Amino acid sequence: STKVEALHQNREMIDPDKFCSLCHATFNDPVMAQQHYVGKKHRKQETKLKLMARYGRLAD
Numbered sequence: 001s002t003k004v005e006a007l008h009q010n011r012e013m014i015d016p017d018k019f020c021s022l023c024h025a026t027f028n029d030p031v032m033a034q035q036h037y038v039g040k041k042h043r044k045q046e047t048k049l050k051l052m053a054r055y056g057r058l059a060d
């Protein structure tokens, strides 16, 4: 995970490190990050976690 640090913008695009708190997933490229945030697995797990948190109010 140390990576071959160079960041040479001559032909390579910007590659920020990113994370998803709904799916517990990490990304290290622009398209990798973007693809996660719009994929079926992100939608499905977002609904699952949202339902778990919303319905979890079993006491008052």
Ligand SMILES: [Zn+2]
Pocket (backbone or CB within 6 Å): 020, 021, 022, 023, 024, 025, 036, 037, 041, 042, 045
């Ligand atoms: Zn996600």
